[PDB]
Amino acid sequence: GQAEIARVSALGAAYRAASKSASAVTAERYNSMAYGRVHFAHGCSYEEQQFNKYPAAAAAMRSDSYGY
Amino acid sequence: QTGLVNSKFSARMAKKTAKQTKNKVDEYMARSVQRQYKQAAVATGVYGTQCTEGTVKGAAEASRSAALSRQFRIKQRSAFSKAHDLFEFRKHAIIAAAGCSYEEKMVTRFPKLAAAMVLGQTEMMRTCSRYVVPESVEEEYMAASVDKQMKRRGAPGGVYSLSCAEGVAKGQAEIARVSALGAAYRAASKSASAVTAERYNSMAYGRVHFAHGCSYEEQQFNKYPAAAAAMRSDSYGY
Amino acid sequence: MLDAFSRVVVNSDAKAAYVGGSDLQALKSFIADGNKRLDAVNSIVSNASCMVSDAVSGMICENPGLISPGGNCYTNRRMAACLRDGEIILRYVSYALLAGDASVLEDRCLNGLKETYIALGVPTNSSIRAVSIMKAQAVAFITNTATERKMSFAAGDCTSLASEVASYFDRVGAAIS
Amino acid sequence: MLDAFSRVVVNSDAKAAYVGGSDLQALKSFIADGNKRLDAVNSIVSNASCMVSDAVSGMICENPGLISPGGNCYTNRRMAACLRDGEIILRYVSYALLAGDASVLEDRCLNGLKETYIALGVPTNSSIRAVSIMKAQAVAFITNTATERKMSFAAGDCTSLASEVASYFDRVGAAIS
Amino acid sequence: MKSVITTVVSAADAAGRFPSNSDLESIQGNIQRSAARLEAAEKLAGNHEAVVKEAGDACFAKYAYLKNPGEAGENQEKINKCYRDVDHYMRLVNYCLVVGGTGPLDEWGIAGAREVYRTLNLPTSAYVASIAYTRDRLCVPRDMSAQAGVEFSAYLDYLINALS
Amino acid sequence: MKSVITTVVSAADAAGRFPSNSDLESIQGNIQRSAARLEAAEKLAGNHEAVVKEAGDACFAKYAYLKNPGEAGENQEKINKCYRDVDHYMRLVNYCLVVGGTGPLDEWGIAGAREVYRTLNLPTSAYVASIAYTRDRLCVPRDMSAQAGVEFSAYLDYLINALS
Amino acid sequence: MKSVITTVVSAADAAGRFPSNSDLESIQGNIQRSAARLEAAEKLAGNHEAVVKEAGDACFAKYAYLKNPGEAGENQEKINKCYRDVDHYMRLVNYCLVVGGTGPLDEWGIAGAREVYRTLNLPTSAYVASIAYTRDRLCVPRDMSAQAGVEFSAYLDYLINALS
Amino acid sequence: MKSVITTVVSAADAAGRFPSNSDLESIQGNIQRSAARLEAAEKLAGNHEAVVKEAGDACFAKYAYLKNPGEAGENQEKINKCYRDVDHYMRLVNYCLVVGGTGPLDEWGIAGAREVYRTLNLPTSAYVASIAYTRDRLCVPRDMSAQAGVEFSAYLDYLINALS
Ligand SMILES: C=CC1=C(C)[C@@H](Cc2[nH]c(/C=C3N=C(/C=C4\NC(=O)[C@H](C)[C@H]4CC)C(C)=C\3CCC(=O)O)c(CCC(=O)O)c2C)NC1=O
Ligand SMILES: C=CC1=C(C)[C@@H](Cc2[nH]c(/C=C3N=C(/C=C4\NC(=O)[C@H](C)[C@H]4CC)C(C)=C\3CCC(=O)O)c(CCC(=O)O)c2C)NC1=O
Ligand SMILES: C=CC1=C(C)[C@@H](Cc2[nH]c(/C=C3N=C(/C=C4\NC(=O)[C@H](C)[C@H]4CC)C(C)=C\3CCC(=O)O)c(CCC(=O)O)c2C)NC1=O
Ligand SMILES: C=CC1=C(C)[C@@H](Cc2[nH]c(/C=C3N=C(/C=C4\NC(=O)[C@H](C)[C@H]4CC)C(C)=C\3CCC(=O)O)c(CCC(=O)O)c2C)NC1=O
Ligand SMILES: C=CC1=C(C)[C@@H](Cc2[nH]c(/C=C3N=C(/C=C4\NC(=O)[C@H](C)[C@H]4CC)C(C)=C\3CCC(=O)O)c(CCC(=O)O)c2C)NC1=O
Ligand SMILES: C=CC1=C(C)[C@@H](Cc2[nH]c(/C=C3N=C(/C=C4\NC(=O)[C@H](C)[C@H]4CC)C(C)=C\3CCC(=O)O)c(CCC(=O)O)c2C)NC1=O
Ligand SMILES: C=CC1=C(C)[C@@H](Cc2[nH]c(/C=C3N=C(/C=C4\NC(=O)[C@H](C)[C@H]4CC)C(C)=C\3CCC(=O)O)c(CCC(=O)O)c2C)NC1=O
Ligand SMILES: C=CC1=C(C)[C@@H](Cc2[nH]c(/C=C3N=C(/C=C4\NC(=O)[C@H](C)[C@H]4CC)C(C)=C\3CCC(=O)O)c(CCC(=O)O)c2C)NC1=O
Ligand SMILES: C=CC1=C(C)[C@@H](Cc2[nH]c(/C=C3N=C(/C=C4\NC(=O)[C@H](C)[C@H]4CC)C(C)=C\3CCC(=O)O)c(CCC(=O)O)c2C)NC1=O
Ligand SMILES: C=CC1=C(C)[C@@H](Cc2[nH]c(/C=C3N=C(/C=C4\NC(=O)[C@H](C)[C@H]4CC)C(C)=C\3CCC(=O)O)c(CCC(=O)O)c2C)NC1=O
Ligand SMILES: C=CC1=C(C)[C@@H](Cc2[nH]c(/C=C3N=C(/C=C4\NC(=O)[C@H](C)[C@H]4CC)C(C)=C\3CCC(=O)O)c(CCC(=O)O)c2C)NC1=O
Ligand SMILES: C=CC1=C(C)[C@@H](Cc2[nH]c(/C=C3N=C(/C=C4\NC(=O)[C@H](C)[C@H]4CC)C(C)=C\3CCC(=O)O)c(CCC(=O)O)c2C)NC1=O
Ligand SMILES: C=CC1=C(C)[C@@H](Cc2[nH]c(/C=C3N=C(/C=C4\NC(=O)[C@H](C)[C@H]4CC)C(C)=C\3CCC(=O)O)c(CCC(=O)O)c2C)NC1=O
Ligand SMILES: CCC1=C(C)[C@@H](CC2=N/C(=C\c3[nH]c(C[C@@H]4NC(=O)C(C)=C4CC)c(C)c3CCC(=O)O)C(CCC(=O)O)=C2C)NC1=O
């Protein structure tokens, strides 16, 4: 049952992130681009040019030893 | 965490994107223009005979049925027929707003506003087919051949398109027949000050929208303005 | 519009009479040489572009005043309108030949054409000479008596279809006169 | 729009390939049982009015909440719109069956219908149950397995046309889902 | 008057095109069918006293309430004008067997049908009862051939679907 | 793509009507012709190396002025792209023999034809010379049957009338 | 929803005009009538079990042919859904007595009425029989007042004229 | 000519509808008001020499600059035509008290008003000064009743709002 509780809790958080303020959706929009560009791009001028267009793809990458 | 990969059960995108509140501007812009264009038919408070839907008891509800599947058919268009609409509606919306470079940008950003402007302005100054009656059989053949050529784009290549559809259930084409038959009587029976008001803006409308300096076509439209009223643009269909 | 099948129905509806074998044998004869009719119309669609060229240039070849300055077929804009009109008339005559009835020729083409040409100043005499040349070409193409081009077919008689299209062409001529 | 003859032409034009007897035998087979297709479509036009009244009333017979106050098929205005929409869908499926191709079903009917019903609040589940009942009626009328009415025909097999219309109906169902 | 030739000529005329091989193709379809859909017009033309008598009283057998005083079919000329209407409808079916099209049914019996029978209280179920009776009174090998039996019934069920 | 079924389905759809006996009638016309207009597609499909070679040089035989330097058909790839065009046109004729319609000729070779050959200086008389040569090189009892010879020539003369 | 205020506000809005003395005048007409057309809504609201029972079986008394097997009103839920419909129609009449307008009759019972009863074979004469019975079962000094009796019957005969 | 009946008849005619209970309701509003808005037309009809004399010189008292040579109201016939205009405007107010509508004000004094006074240099403030003076010279219990005093002033302030 615990995976189901963690399901429903992760399902509510997705609604809460899709419903926040207009000043915070465009604040998390920019530091995501910057975060991906410094932590993972490292001068590869394609990957920056992908992260600027699409920063949710920049936010969706972790480091290696986080797992999952 | 997305609806695609194997992690999630069918709940996503609970938010306003920049799509939808773009399109809700064009909704309101089309409606606040149809208001101002219908506000010329009801000038002093009485409803004029132009803005009468039905004459049978259930002709108005059936015209609402016909007019709701009308603009659903506009949504059932190909991508080649999506794109061909706005790039000539923008052309023709420039011709409506002669000066006023405010309106030149106003009709150029918004896409359902310019479609409403070119049909509300011809409904407002009464330059349609079904409002002008030929003063002689002379103009009747003139306007017959314009209707012949203008319905060629409604059946392109031998096949009919949905844009020429006339009813979607049985009996509905007959209701739309009788409703179009009453409107022709009502247009042939109006005031003497309105038959010669629709006579002039028809000449002017044809001359600016379709003649474009061809000194023959003006010289045809001045003699015969029901032939000028009987020509549409391309992406109206029918 | 009507065709050959519809005109007996319209004629019998004004009697309140059922149609039977009193007049269905004419329709069965329309059916039996109906393949001759499809052999007939195709010879005009095959040579439709040469027919207007041979007709409208022959009109000027017999009347050089149409291209004198001021004439009806004088300038480059008016020549295109006349070459367009000739092919429109040929298209409607081919419609009436395929239909077996001159209903589509009357209302969509000839209804209101005479005083349209009167208001435009189009001379009727040259127009009549333009349709009659096309009639002479059509009756030569139907019977395969064309001197310049011959086609392939099954052998037999086709004067019925040649006569039908000959009756359609001066029906066009009588309306614009 | 396209039909069965046009789709091989569209498919072969993107090869720059001439069509021949590599794939004309499929079209000749489309021709040979083409009279079976005309026997097939006529059974749906004969019973088109009963099909929508057996479909839409069965939809409520399995779901009484559509006519609860507030429901989609609740009032007298909305019932007419739903009975109209069912017959429109049946009309386009009959177009696609006569054409031998689902091109006319896509663009003129199904292109933009799903989010049209989403914007109107039309429940999709009841709509799917409405098209599927009509599918079950159509496959019974094609094969003459209808329990209430039988028709006259020449004997033989018609599962290919029954399968074509069965593939058209859940093609309608997949687009509005 | 939608026949098979009116369909192709107006389609070629809307596009401004000469009659091509598409348009020539449709006319031979009005050669192979039309050898045998005109024998149904023979069967309908010589038998029309009996088939509108046999179908004229079928609706009154189903709906005997019409003959009541104050009801719809009150007096004798009511019934005479009703048999007139059944004769008119079978005449249009006889026309449609001859054009190869539903044109004479459409623009002479079907267009504006619902806006008469509603305002005059003529029940359309009584109209479809006679045509439905005539549709199943026909058995194929006695009255006509196989090609004629399907095409005669197809114009009947088209009017049945159009009337209600 | 005007075939015989696209003509009737869109005509029924513009009126909001079910497919009636008119629409069913047109399809059997695509049964009686179409047994023998597809043998012309066999004759065109296996012989297309030779019939576009024999017609490809017929226009250069009539119009030898094209091969001049500075003229229209200057170098070798001019002639290669010209033979490509004759192959493309005979492919659309082969398609039109198979649909039973002029659709694939129209929307793939005829629509927008005049607005290319004028701006690129391709003379349309050189295009109609090859098709006219192919029209009279055919004699009926050697290459195909009688039904095939008329319908193969009818799609050729339709394109001849459309190109000029 | 054509009430007396929806009529004048939209008429002033189509002209772009403020509400003038014409528009203010129409509202006091909804003061003098509306003191007594709402007592008819009291009479209809507390008596609606009996007036749709008394009118529900009047159509079956006139039209006993409906209850036959294979006929229109075959089984028991047929009759239950028919009494449901008579209740729905008298509810819209009760609404129309309250708005002072024919709006709730129009857009909830009258719009699209004819395109249901024809395709489902519901005879509209059976619908107008109940409403006509309810129109003459009312006598004025027993059930309501004089102002209420005319305005209650006027919404009934409006629906009678609209249904047929 | 927007009266209370022209508003409802054209609204019923645009929809193709018979005059229903909405349309009948608006006319009794022209019964309860119209017993007392016509006494204002009595007060205006017998007193119109004095009320346009008293208001005619009020604008010249406020705007004495008009009477200068070279200015707007130069000579005597200027003043005569100005008093003519005040008489014309009070006549249209007298008409509007009688129709129960602003129609005769609109299409006879208000439509095209601004496109005359601008091109002829007639100052609209001088026009609204007389009507504003007439609006507050009226006190209710001496000249008319209470129902008449509000409806006479309402047609005056409507023209005041329309002129500027
Ligand atoms: C929602 C989007 C939206 C727009 C883009 C504008 C477009 C627009 N303007 C006017 C109406 C008008 N538009 C203008 C503006 C101009 N007229 C001119 O002669 C100049 C060329 C031009 C810019 C200076 C004026 C002065 C009027 C009032 C009179 C008139 O129609 O000319 C009307 C008709 C309404 C009416 O007159 O009753 C419309 C649709 N209005 C809108 O509501
Ligand atoms: C549906 C049927 C149908 C037709 C029959 C034509 C009929 C027709 N022809 C012309 C118009 C014309 N028609 C002609 C023709 C001629 N002058 C002659 O002496 C010759 C007899 C003849 C050429 C063979 C000319 C020259 C004009 C143009 C007049 C001008 O600009 O000078 C016009 C006016 C429109 C225009 O200017 O193009 C029309 C409606 N159009 C149709 O839609
Ligand atoms: C300068 C003066 C000049 C002329 C006098 C005419 C010459 C001319 N040729 C024809 C007559 C014709 N014109 C054609 C047309 C054609 N023949 C073909 O086989 C081709 C397919 C197509 C043109 C390419 C046909 C078929 C006839 C009938 C006689 C014949 O078969 O040649 C007629 C009609 C006879 C009549 O009036 O009754 C005329 C007047 N053209 C001119 O330019
Ligand atoms: C779209 C394609 C298509 C066609 C074009 C026609 C093609 C065609 N025509 C004929 C057949 C024929 N065609 C003709 C016609 C003529 N013979 C002549 O000598 C004259 C030149 C011309 C007169 C107009 C005759 C006389 C016959 C044979 C007799 C007949 O068919 O009745 C036949 C033989 C079948 C039959 O006997 O009916 C065919 C297939 N049918 C088609 O399916
Ligand atoms: C060309 C193709 C084509 C279509 C498919 C339809 C699609 C369609 N349906 C509706 C409109 C509608 N459609 C329905 C239907 C239903 N509600 C249900 O739960 C059932 C599943 C279903 C009946 C079987 C209803 C009830 C409305 C009206 C909504 C309302 O007013 O409440 C509308 C809006 C126009 C109108 O209000 O009539 C459109 C465009 N129209 C077309 O032109
Ligand atoms: C109140 C509850 C209620 C129901 C549950 C349904 C009953 C019903 N009937 C059919 C099924 C059908 N309905 C028809 C329709 C007809 N048969 C004919 O011969 C006539 C011509 C025409 C109507 C007059 C046909 C042909 C079938 C297929 C089975 C059969 O042949 O009877 C189906 C489809 C089966 C499925 O879902 O897959 C349902 C649900 N109707 C209701 O009212
Ligand atoms: C518009 C009028 C018109 C039609 C309706 C059809 C009518 C029709 N169908 C068939 C003929 C046939 N029809 C069927 C079809 C069926 N048989 C069954 O058992 C099933 C109920 C059904 C499957 C869908 C079969 C199996 C044949 C005989 C085999 C065949 O024709 O290929 C035939 C005999 C000719 C032939 O053999 O092809 C005819 C005239 N044709 C027309 O011209
Ligand atoms: C050419 C096509 C054509 C038709 C399809 C019919 C359709 C039709 N029927 C009627 C008219 C009628 N139809 C009936 C028939 C009936 N009413 C009854 O009382 C009986 C219950 C029922 C018998 C089934 C009656 C009585 C009239 C006359 C109207 C009347 O008396 O109320 C009328 C009015 C003119 C007339 O009196 O004939 C028309 C146009 N008539 C046509 O000309
Ligand atoms: C043109 C349209 C047309 C029709 C629809 C029929 C309709 C019809 N059927 C019958 C009369 C009959 N028809 C049949 C035929 C049959 N009964 C059956 O049980 C079998 C299923 C079926 C074919 C064997 C029989 C057995 C009778 C005599 C008994 C009766 O009247 O039903 C009669 C009386 C005279 C006669 O027999 O012809 C008529 C006019 N006749 C027509 O002229
Ligand atoms: C599917 C349908 C289809 C067609 C009908 C043709 C039509 C066509 N031809 C050309 C294009 C061409 N056609 C020619 C042919 C000629 N020009 C000459 O120099 C010679 C005189 C003459 C030989 C007869 C040439 C040379 C080009 C290339 C354009 C150029 O080089 O100027 C092009 C431009 C693209 C290309 O290079 O192929 C197209 C679309 N191609 C198609 O794909
Ligand atoms: C809010 C406004 C409103 C109305 C005016 C009515 C109108 C109406 N009636 C019916 C629907 C119906 N009406 C009847 C009634 C009858 N048919 C018979 O068999 C008897 C002869 C007759 C009794 C008089 C029946 C049986 C149905 C269900 C359809 C059917 O079973 O065929 C339906 C379909 C939905 C349903 O089942 O209720 C609607 C919208 N309902 C409404 O909600
Ligand atoms: C809100 C709507 C509404 C109605 C339309 C009536 C309808 C109605 N009438 C009666 C019942 C009755 N109604 C009357 C009244 C009359 N019979 C006559 O002959 C006179 C002309 C007339 C007025 C004196 C009589 C005498 C009875 C008893 C006998 C009967 O049932 O008809 C009953 C049974 C209980 C009762 O009396 O109220 C009902 C519900 N009542 C309502 O609540
Ligand atoms: C039926 C409705 C109706 C009206 C509302 C008025 C409106 C009106 N006033 C004037 C016209 C005028 N109005 C004035 C009045 C004035 N200008 C001055 O010099 C003074 C400052 C000022 C007094 C207040 C004058 C002088 C003219 C004549 C124009 C002129 O001489 O310049 C005219 C031109 C015709 C005329 O001479 O009367 C009209 C239509 N007249 C009407 O018939
Ligand atoms: C879905 C798309 C759509 C339509 C198309 C129309 C069609 C239509 N117009 C109507 C009804 C109608 N129409 C007009 C006139 C018309 N109305 C105006 O507001 C102006 C400025 C008018 C002139 C153009 C009037 C006066 C009425 C009566 C209802 C009212 O507005 O008071 C009615 C109601 C009929 C009835 O109630 O019986 C319909 C169905 N309505 C729609 O909803």
Cβ neighbours of B154 in E, within 8 Å: 14
DSSP B48: P
Residue spans of alpha helices (H) in chain G? 4-14, 21-32, 39-46, 48-62, 76-99, 103-105, 114-117, 124-137, 140-143, 146-163
Q: Do chains F and G touch (3 or more CB pairs under 8 A)?
A: no
Instruction: State how far the Cα of A14 lies from the Cα of B12, in Å rounded to an integer.
Output: 8
Q: How many domains does chain E contain in total?
A: 1
- Rg, Å, chain H Cα set: 18
Instruction: State how far the Cα of E135 lies from the Cα of D149, in Å rounded to an integer.
Output: 12
Angle of helix G124-137 relative to helix G146-163, nearest 10 degrees, comes to 170
The amino acid at residue E90 is M
Count Cβ atoms within 10 A of the Cβ of residue H62 and give its class: 0-12 exposed, 13-18 middle, 19 or more buried: middle
> Which residue ranges of C are tagged as binding site for phycourobilin?
50, 61
Closest by Cα among H56, F100, E53, H1 to D99: F100
Report whether E147 contacts E153 (CB < 8 A): no
Closest by Cα among B190, B228, B237 to B78: B237
Instruction: State how far the Cα of E118 lies from the Cα of E127, in Å rounded to an integer.
Output: 13
> Which tokens is E91 given?
């005449």
Report whether F11 contacts F22 (CB < 8 A): no
**Residue B122 Cα distances to C2, C98, H31, angstroms:** 35, 40, 41
Cited resolution, angstroms: 3.0
Which residue among C148, C151, C170 has the greatest number of ligand 3 atoms within 8 angstroms of its CB, and so is best to mutate?
Answer: C148
Method: cryo-EM
Q: Is C60 in the pocket of ligand 3 (CB under 6 A)?
A: no
The amino acid at residue A15 is Y
Contact pairs from chain E to chain F, CB under 8 Å: 90
DSSP F118: T
> Which tokens is H108 given?
């006879």
> Which tokens is E48 given?
């029309």
Residue E144: left (phi > 0), alpha (psi -120 to 50), or beta? Answer: beta
Instruction: State how far the Cα of A55 lies from the Cα of A39, in Å rounded to an integer.
Output: 13
Q: Is F28 in the pocket of ligand 7 (CB under 6 A)?
A: yes
Burial code (b: 16+ CB inside 10 Å, e: under 16) for B217-238 equals: bbebbeebbbbbbbbbbebebe
**Residue B206 Cα distances to B121, B214, B224, E122, H126, angstroms:** 13, 12, 10, 49, 44
Cβ contact F6–B158 (<8 Å):
yes
- Rg, Å, chain A Cα set: 15
For tokens 């679907």, the residue is E161
How many Å lie between the alpha carbon of B142 and the closest alpha carbon of chain E? 17
Residue C62 in 3-state DSSP?
A: helix
* H or E, element range at A46: helix A45-51
F154 closest CB neighbour out of C46, C48, C154: C46
DSSP H68: S
Query: Which chains have 3+ CB pairs within 8 A of H?
Result: B, G
The amino acid at residue F64 is A
Report whether B60 contacts H15 (CB < 8 A): yes
Q: Please provide residue G72's backbone torsions phi and psi, each rounded to the nearest 5 degrees.
A: -70, -65
Count Cβ atoms within 10 A of the Cβ of residue F11 and give its class: 0-12 exposed, 13-18 middle, 19 or more buried: buried
Distance from first CA to last CA of chain H, Å, rounded?
21
CA angle centred on C66, ends C62 and C70, rounded to 5°: 160
The amino acid at residue H39 is E
**Residue F6 Cα distances to C168, D97, E140, F1, F13, angstroms:** 30, 12, 32, 7, 10
Q: What share of chain A is helix, strand, coil (3-state, %, to 5)?
A: 70, 0, 30
- Which ligand is closest to the CA of F126, given by its number? 10
> Could you tell me which residues come within 8 angstroms of residue C84 by beta carbon, excluding any fewer than 6 positions away?
none
Q: Is C113 in the pocket of ligand 2 (CB under 6 A)?
A: yes
> Which tokens is C126 given?
């040259």
> Which tokens is E116 given?
């008469």
Instruction: State how far the Cα of D129 lies from the Cα of B154, in Å rounded to an integer.
Output: 35
**Residue G57 Cα distances to C131, E70, E71, angstroms:** 75, 19, 18
Report whether F29 contacts F4 (CB < 8 A): yes
Count Cβ atoms within 10 A of the Cβ of residue F76 and give its class: 0-12 exposed, 13-18 middle, 19 or more buried: exposed
Residues comprising chain G, all counted: 164
Which CATH number describes the domain made up of C1-177?
1.10.490.20
- Rg, Å, chain C Cα set: 18
Instruction: State how far the Cα of D162 lies from the Cα of D143, in Å rounded to an integer.
Output: 7
Q: Which residue of F has its CA nearest to C154?
A: F146
Instruction: State how far the Cα of C87 lies from the Cα of C53, in Å rounded to an integer.
Output: 10
* H or E, element range at H153: helix H146-163
Q: Which residue of F has its CA nearest to E100?
A: F22
Other C-beta atoms closer than 10 Å to the C-beta of G127 total 22
Report whether D9 contacts F95 (CB < 8 A): yes
For tokens 């008009």, the residue is H66
Residue spans of alpha helices (H) in C4-75? 4-13, 24-32, 34-45, 48-62
CATH no. for residue H35? 1.10.490.20
> Which tokens is C69 given?
């300055």
For tokens 């091969």, the residue is F67
> Which tokens is C113 given?
């054409």
Other C-beta atoms closer than 10 Å to the C-beta of C65 total 13
Residues comprising chain H, all counted: 164
> Which tokens is B55 given?
């004459």
Q: Is C128 in the pocket of ligand 3 (CB under 6 A)?
A: no
Instruction: State how far the Cα of B102 lies from the Cα of B117, in Å rounded to an integer.
Output: 15
CA angle centred on C30, ends C28 and C34, rounded to 5°: 115
Residue C168 in 3-state DSSP?
A: helix
> Could you tell me which residues come within 8 angstroms of residue D73 by beta carbon, excluding any fewer than 6 positions away?
D56, D59, D60, D66, D67, D79, D82, D126
Instruction: State how far the Cα of E53 lies from the Cα of E47, in Å rounded to an integer.
Output: 10
Annotate chain E with three-state secondary structure.
CCCHHHHHHHHHHHCCCCCCHHHHHHHHHHHHCCCCCCHHHHHHHHCHHHHHHHHHHHHHHHCHHHHCCCCCCCCHHHHHHHHHHHHHHHHHHHHHHHHCCCHHHHHHHHCCCHHHHCCCCCCHHHHHHHHHHHHHHCCHHHHCCHHHHHHHHHHHHHHHHHHC
The amino acid at residue G47 is N
Count Cβ atoms within 10 A of the Cβ of residue E75 and give its class: 0-12 exposed, 13-18 middle, 19 or more buried: exposed
Its domain, for residue H31, covers 1-164
Closest by Cα among D177, G76, G93, E94 to C9: E94
What is the distance of C-alpha C91 from the center of its chain? Answer: 7
| Alpha-carbon torsion angle B117, B119, B121, B122, nearest 10 | 160
Instruction: State how far the Cα of C138 lies from the Cα of G97, in Å rounded to an integer.
Output: 75
> Which tokens is F40 given?
């012309």
How many Å lie between the centroid of ligand 13 and the Cα of residue H85?
6
- On whether H59 is known to bind a ligand per the annotation, the reply is no
Q: Is E76 on the interface with D (CB under 8 A)?
A: no
Domain residue spans in chain C? 1-177
Residue nearest to atom 35 of ligand 7 (CA): D35
Instruction: State how far the Cα of G130 lies from the Cα of G122, in Å rounded to an integer.
Output: 14
> Could you tell me which residues come within 8 angstroms of residue F79 by beta carbon, excluding any fewer than 6 positions away?
F60, F67, F73
Residue B117 in 3-state DSSP?
A: helix
Residue C38 in 3-state DSSP?
A: helix
Report whether G110 contacts G95 (CB < 8 A): no
Instruction: State how far the Cα of B101 lies from the Cα of H66, in Å rounded to an integer.
Output: 40
- On whether D73 is known to bind a ligand per the annotation, the reply is no
Instruction: State how far the Cα of G12 lies from the Cα of D91, in Å rounded to an integer.
Output: 44
Distance from first CA to last CA of chain E, Å, rounded?
21
How many Å lie between the centroid of ligand 3 and the Cα of residue C54?
5
> Which tokens is F38 given?
């597809």
DSSP B6: S
Residue G126 in 3-state DSSP?
A: helix
Q: Is G44 in the pocket of ligand 12 (CB under 6 A)?
A: yes
Report whether E79 contacts E142 (CB < 8 A): no
Residue spans of alpha helices (H) in chain C? 4-13, 24-32, 34-45, 48-62, 76-99, 103-105, 114-120, 124-142, 159-176
> Which tokens is B225 given?
């303005």
Cβ contact D6–F99 (<8 Å):
yes
Evaluated on CA atoms B176, B182, B186, B189, the torsion sign reads positive
